[PDB]
């Protein structure tokens, strides 16, 4: 038969199944398909050829095509996935037909492997999903200029599916508005133009409103240089204009640099304004976490809404935030979603970087633009550094009182003018170790490492006196007042210190101000007791209840007495004995040093006079003016008044200075001490001064004595070099005819040392502890010459 | 057999042709296809079925297949347009197979009604056509994140294509720079996002080019809601990032709110970066007419120049300025040019709006501000002070600015000010005028002090200004202005003029404005170099001054003073060139040389007359430094035959116990070597006296300042008496310098000064004739 060779040598797999669905034939094309050999399946049910997972459903097809023939249909051709003997489920073209071989109900199947063309179709699928995700809408036309094929982009842009857009004139599909009439003519011209061209038209949507499109026709020829295809493409000009203006406006608002959440708010406002029927909410990255940053007030739920993602990223690296927008389907094309998303995302990156930059700028702004004092950030840094150093500072909060009333009356033009000299006065009395800051408004924070109560009271008093002179503006007095809250405790944090200071400040201010106060006692009792001491001391000086002690000093080699040096002393009926080392600083603090000096010199004169009444007794008497902080305003009158009201021959009494008060500074005490010298008072010192100028000054008004200090004498045994220093000092003494005194001598050993070093007088316990004022006439004649 | 119905009754169109191309079989499906009858087609030429327009060549194709073999291809399949008997033409798929009967050559053609094939071929066309028409790269990724799709846009913009890129991960396919901003991780995860996402990358072409791209990935799920593919679009954001950089940077500028002109210049520079080899001009509407705002520093001629212009308008649409660009033809695309133009337009409009919208202390570092500087200079002018003004501009800041923005340009300036403060002297008024410019006002005017200050300030910034491990090297331009009687504004203007000159010339340097003193400093540097050469060729000398006891008139010792003579400059005294030595940094060498020569001449004098008692070198007047005492005394004494105990040295108390004190132990070891000392003041109280008597000084040198005026000032007469007495009390020798007259000599012999020196006995004598004087007139009793 002619059919035998044609059927045998064929490239399409042919199979036949009987009415019972059993196979009886195979060909090399079928063997290339599936993989089974002919003999493996000849005369067997089709089931094994059927896919293993499809066999359960195949009997349904068998019944449908055998009991009713699928409503009397012989067969058909379509695509099907074939499982090759290797197990691969390849795609192929199958065909079925009904055949009456042997007069029975047989079925003939044809198969052709279609893997390559299936792959081509898959490539089509990928590119079409891309075309859907292909920003600007595009459509294709045959030379007859009828839309043959389109995309999801054009479908979104003009509400026309491919089923609606197949094979018709582009305008007929896109019913254009009649006004103006030239729209149709121009679009037909561009439609049948064979060269690439672009123009502007005024199309009308499926659903309504006019739009102005920028239509673009372009050609594509073939190998034979004939029109093969055309592309008509466009996306927009109207919403593109909208978004260009949107970006302009959002840039303008962002340039206005509004706060972080307000920036989010403006972004939301504009994004809603354009893509209405949508919700917007941005997340900022803080501590690496997504925090709700902004959200539009239009949070009403909208049916059929799709979320759309975007990542706000800074100049480099990980995300800085998450942008996401939910939009109602059909509001605008997916391409326009992508477009607005890009602009919003990058604009948000700019906004967040702006926020971070302003954060850093504010952090680095730790100073003041008006006064110039370091500001609260610097103060916190400084206190934290002090705590780390483990040094306990004392924080003073100084608050101005009258400045608010000044603002209320005359205004800031006077308030700031007052604060200028307020801070100037602060800085004038500032000290090298101190640290000043301006936390806020009319409040200041002063910091010092001094922890003594006696020093704290002094610093507070200086600060309080800063306003001792009322502020003068245009000859108008302004008596401002200061409320001072101090705090100092061990182990507390800067936060506690500041809070406590502020509370103390408010308490004292509301109490009346013009004053200072410690933390709540705490040590306010330690201050009350010291105030008690001060009041008692003032009363004591007024009543003249003090005691003056006396201390002989004797020549080292003769044993004869050279003189006596006096020392102030105070015995209290209540508190008992209190030393100068404590009540002289207290005298300075309570402003009684002038008085104590007066009294000590007076009593010295009393004793000298009464003793001369008896006999020559005292050759010379010494009183330590330096140890009593004797100021410039005291010397001439305070000495001469007594020296003359009673009878003292000048050379009888002597005074002592520490050479620091002697350096010129601004007192020029030189003249006062010269007057004392003229009266005949001996001059005693402890050092020679800065250099040649110092020595020349010392010799110019020739001083009489030079007093080696106990600090040197006691450590003489420790250090031989100090012995050399003393040798030099005594040698200079002999050179200039200066009497060299030594203080704090204690034992026979130091006495022998000074003997060999030619000290020429000794004062200290080793010969007599300072004996009370009345034993002197007995001790002198009963112990001298203490040879 | 079933072989017959399998074809005869088959609904699949199949035809057979023999060696003569005669149709031997024609199925009813073939009848349905063509329109012929089986009895009419059987035994006839295949051409009858072949389309008439194609029939003539069909026999030729059959003959070629029969004769040439064509590699014995078994079969093939493709589509073609069929022509029916009635004349109607239709499109049909088909396939050919080679069959043989009776040992001859036969051909079998099978036909399919191409409906899905036709539609899908039409589509494939339309789709490739559409994508190609558009010029946006796009690719597709399988679930394994492997590219399985490309387009002409992707291949042209990336070089790669499916032929090479098929089935390979995007990161590997996409070369990237060496972690410039750690974008490797960005690419890696973006290629792993499980939802539609988008960011930006830098990728390098096959040639390698840092081009910027906007990756937007979008997932597409199958019908059953499973991730099927990931379609990604690379938008060419080279231009778009130009837009970005433009805004971002100028927005940052706007936030920093610089001067109007500075904003304009920022715009100029970055727009120029955007448009290569272009020119930019900016005008603004002032007083109702366009007046210059700014312009690009570039002003050279442009070949094939193209001019574009735009009117900057406010929100209301009214004009606000005129921007213009000149670009070289072919350098930039028109689309790019227009985009940069309009973005610049609107952004700069916002900048102008910010300008329209827009206290005696710097709120950032802590220096005064221009108002305070003006007040300070005014308060100096009213007192008639002629302040020397150093206007310091910190150059290379632009790298800091572009790297970390104005917020950190502030940090850089903070570091600059912090480094400057540590050296700022008292009586020096440092303020910050604006941005990157500081004003240091000083009172001292002597040119030597001015130059020293300038050098110190330039040096203190020697070390890089490190910020967050990014040591930006910043440089200093120091304009100097100074002129008697000139006001604050002129001083500032001229200082800025000199600063502008040195900045444009390169910076990292300092410059006077006034040319007279500008050449004066040049001559001063000439003198410095001359002395530098002179010391190196060691042409110097040392004049001596014998000094004698006041009792026997016998020689006590000889001083050694430096000297330098040049044929060009003539005599240049030490009093003048020693500070020049300080400036040039050769004081150490001068000290070395004076020491060496004193020792050598001592040895030479030993070789004939060893009687030379002692030699004294005035280190205090020579500005000796801390670390040179021990070495360059010991070296000289050992090298020469001098005994060390023969020469002494002189040092003042300030240098004795200030500027640290390791100098103290160095003088300890010097005394250990045994060199006698000679002190000036032994000041600073009892501690000073302790040092004095602990390090045997062996002599005290009363200077001319005191020796003179002795007959007049009673206070200094008393000082002299006291100090002579102190020396006599110790075992110290007292020296009186600069005695000039017989009455002064008589007074000094009264106060018992031991050794006298000065012109009253001997003007200094050169290296020779010292022996003549010493041997002729020694006992000048
Ligand atoms: C890889 C092997 C096979 C697969 C994947 C497969 C799959 C299918 C499926 C899913 C259907 C339902 C309708 C359609 O998709 O066309 C069908 C229909 C059918 N199948 Fe199969 N089948 C295979 C093998 C066969 C063979 C070789 C025959 C031989 C007769 C057969 C007999 C039938 C019949 C008679 C129908 C009725 C279809 C109609 O009348 O339109 N099956 N097949
Ligand atoms: C509408 C009907 C047909 C058309 C338009 C057509 C067209 C062509 C053309 C143009 C070629 C040249 C090779 C090529 O273009 O790839 C060709 C090849 C060939 N055709 Fe056809 N043909 C038709 C029907 C048939 C039929 C029914 C047969 C029966 C055997 C046949 C046998 C052949 C053979 C043997 C070749 C040689 C292939 C080769 O050498 O590569 N043609 N055909």
UniProtKB/Swiss-Prot annotation, chain A:
Entries under SUPFAM superfamilies matching the protein: EAL domain-like (SSF141868), Nucleotide cyclase (SSF55073), PYP-like sensor domain (PAS domain) (SSF55785)
PAS domain boundaries: 1-70, 123-196
Alphabetized GO MF terms: cyclic-guanylate-specific phosphodiesterase activity; heme binding; magnesium ion binding; oxygen sensor activity; protein homodimerization activity
Outcome reported for the amino acid change (mutating residue 575 to A): Loss of cAMP PDE activity
EAL domain ranges (all copies): 530-784
Alphabetized UniProt keyword annotations: c-di-GMP, Heme, Hydrolase, Iron, Magnesium, Metal-binding, Repeat, Sensory transduction, Transcription, Transcription regulation
Induction: Expressed in the late exponential growth phase and at higher levels in the stationary phase. A member of the dosCP operon. Expression is RpoS dependent and is higher at 28 degrees Celsius than at 37 degrees Celsius.
Short name of one Pfam family: GGDEF
Domain of life of the organism encoding this protein: Bacteria
Residues of the GGDEF domain: 391-521
Swiss-Prot/TrEMBL catalytic activity: 3',3'-c-di-GMP + H2O = 5'-phosphoguanylyl(3'->5')guanosine + H(+)
InterPro entries xref list: Biofilm_reg_signaling (IPR052155), Diguanyl_cyclase/Pdiesterase (IPR012226), EAL_dom (IPR001633), EAL_sf (IPR035919), GGDEF_dom (IPR000160), Nucleotide_cyclase (IPR029787), PAC (IPR001610), PAS (IPR000014)
Domain PAC intervals: 197-249
EC number(s) recorded for this UniProt protein: 3.1.4.52
Consequence of changing residue 80 to F: Alters O(2) binding, increases auto-oxidation
Stated role: Heme-based oxygen sensor protein displaying phosphodiesterase (PDE) activity toward c-di-GMP in response to oxygen availability. Involved in the modulation of intracellular c-di-GMP levels, in association with DosC which catalyzes the biosynthesis of c-di-GMP (diguanylate cyclase activity). Cyclic-di-GMP is a second messenger which controls cell surface-associated traits in bacteria. Has very poor PDE activity on cAMP but is not active with cGMP, bis(p-nitrophenyl) phosphate or p-nitrophenyl phosphate.
Domain notes: The EAL domain (residues 532 to 799) is a cyclic dinucleotide di-GMP (c-di-GMP) PDE hydrolyzing c-di-GMP to 5'pGpG; it has no activity on cAMP. Binding of an external ligand to the heme located in the N-terminal sensory domain displaces the distal heme ligand from Met-76 to the ligand and triggers a conformational change that regulates the activity of the C-terminal catalytic domain.
Assembly and interaction partners: Homodimer; has been previously suggested to be a homotetramer based on size exclusion chromatography. Forms a complex with DosC.
Name by which UniProt lists this protein: Oxygen sensor protein DosP
Organismal lineage: Bacteria, Pseudomonadati, Pseudomonadota, Gammaproteobacteria, Enterobacterales
Name of encoding gene: dosP
């Amino acid at each position: 038969g002619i059919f035998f060779p044609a059927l045998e040598q064929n490239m399409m797999g042919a199979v036949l199944i009987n009415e019972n669905d059993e196979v009886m034939f195979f060909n090399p094309a079928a063997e290339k398909l599936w993989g089974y050999k002919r003999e493996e399946v000849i005369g067997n049910n089709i089931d094994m050829l059927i896919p293993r997972d499809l066999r359960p459903a195949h009997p349904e097809y068998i019944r449908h095509n055998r009991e009713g023939g699928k409503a009397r249909v012989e067969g058909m051709s379509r695509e099907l996935q074939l499982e090759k003997k290797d197990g691969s489920k390849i795609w192929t073209r199958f065909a079925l037909s009904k055949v009456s071989a042997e007069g029975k109900v047989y079925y003939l199947a044809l198969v052709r492997d279609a893997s390559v063309e299936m792959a081509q179709k898959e490539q089509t699928r990928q590119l079409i999903i891309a075309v859907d995700h292909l920003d600007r809408p595009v459509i294709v036309l045959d030379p007859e200029r009828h839309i043959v094929q389109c995309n999801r982009a054009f479908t979104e842009m003009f509400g026309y599916c491919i089923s609606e857009a197949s094979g018709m004139q582009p305008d007929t599909l896109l019913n254009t508005p009649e006004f103006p009439a030239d729209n149709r003519i121009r679009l037909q011209q561009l439609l049948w133009k064979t060269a690439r061209d672009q123009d502007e038209f005024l199309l009308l949507t499926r659903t309504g409103e006019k739009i102005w499109i920028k239509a673009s026709i372009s050609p594509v020829y073939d190998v034979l240089a004939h029109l093969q295809n055309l592309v008509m493409t466009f996306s927009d000009i109207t919403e593109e204009r909208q978004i260009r203006q949107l970006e302009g406006n959002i840039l303008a608002a962002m340039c206005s640099s509004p706060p972080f959440h307000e920036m989010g708010e403006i972004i939301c406002r504009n994004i809603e304004s354009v893509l209405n029927e949508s919700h917007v909410s941005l997340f900022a990255l803080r501590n690496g976490m997504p925090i709700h940053w902004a959200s539009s007030s239009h949070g009403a739920e909208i049916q059929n809404a799709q979320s759309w993602s975007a990542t706000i990223r800074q100049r480099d690296g990980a995300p800085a935030g998450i942008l996401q927008i939910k939009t109602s389907s059909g509001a605008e094309t997916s391409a326009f979603i992508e477009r607005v998303a890009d602009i919003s995302q990058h604009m948000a990156a700019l906004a967040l970087e702006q926020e971070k930059s302003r954060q850093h700028i504010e952090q680095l702004i730790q100073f003041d633009p008006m006064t110039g004092l370091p500001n609260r950030n610097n103060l916190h840094n400084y206190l934290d550094d002090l705590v780390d150093k483990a040094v306990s500072p004392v924080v003073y909060l100084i608050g101005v009182d009258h400045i608010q009333d000044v603002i209320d009356s005359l205004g800031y033009a006077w308030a700031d003018q007052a604060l200028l000299e307020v801070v100037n006065r602060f800085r004038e009395k500032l000290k090298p170790d101190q640290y000043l800051c301006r936390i806020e408004g009319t409040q200041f924070v002063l910091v010092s490492l001094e922890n003594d109560v006696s020093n704290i009271t002094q610093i507070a008093d200086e600060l309080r006196n800063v306003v001792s002179k009322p502020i003068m503006i245009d000859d108008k007095p302004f008596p401002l007042t200061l409320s001072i809250g101090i705090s100092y405790d061990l182990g507390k944090n800067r936060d506690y210190l500041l809070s406590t200071a502020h509370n103390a400040m408010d308490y004292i201010r509301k109490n009346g101000g013009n004053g200072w106060q410690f933390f709540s006692p705490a040590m306010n009792e330690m201050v009350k007791e010291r105030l008690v001491l001060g009041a008692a001391l003032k009363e004591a000086i007024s009543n003249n209840q003090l005691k003056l002690v006396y201390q002989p000093q004797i020549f080292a080699e003769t044993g004869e007495l050279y003189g006596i040096e006096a020392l102030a002393r105070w015995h209290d009926p209540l508190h008992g004995h209190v030393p100068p080392s404590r009540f002289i600083p207290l005298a300075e603090e309570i402003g009684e040093i002038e008085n104590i000096g007066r009294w000590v010199i007076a009593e010295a004169c009393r004793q000298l006079a009464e003793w001369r009444s008896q006999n020559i007794h005292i050759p010379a008497l010494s009183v330590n003016l330096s140890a009593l902080h004797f100021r410039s305003n005291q010397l001439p009158n305070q000495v001469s008044d007594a020296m003359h009201a009673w009878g003292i021959d000048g050379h009888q009494l002597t005074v002592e200075i520490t050479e620091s008060m002697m350096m010129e500074h601004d007192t020029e005490i030189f003249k006062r001490i010269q007057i004392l010298r003229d009266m005949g008072v001996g001059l005693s010192v402890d050092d020679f001064g800065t250099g040649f100028s110092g020595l020349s000054r010392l010799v110019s008004l020739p001083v009489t004595e030079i007093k080696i200090d106990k600090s040197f004498v006691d450590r003489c045994l420790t250090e031989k070099r100090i012995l050399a220093l003393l040798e030099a000092i005594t040698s200079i003494g002999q050179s200039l005819n200066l009497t060299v005194v030594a203080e704090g001598v204690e034992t026979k050993e130091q006495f022998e040392m000074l003997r060999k070093i030619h000290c020429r007088v000794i004062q200290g316990y080793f010969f007599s502890r300072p004996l009370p004022a009345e034993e002197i006439p007995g001790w002198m004649s009963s112990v001298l010459p203490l040879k």
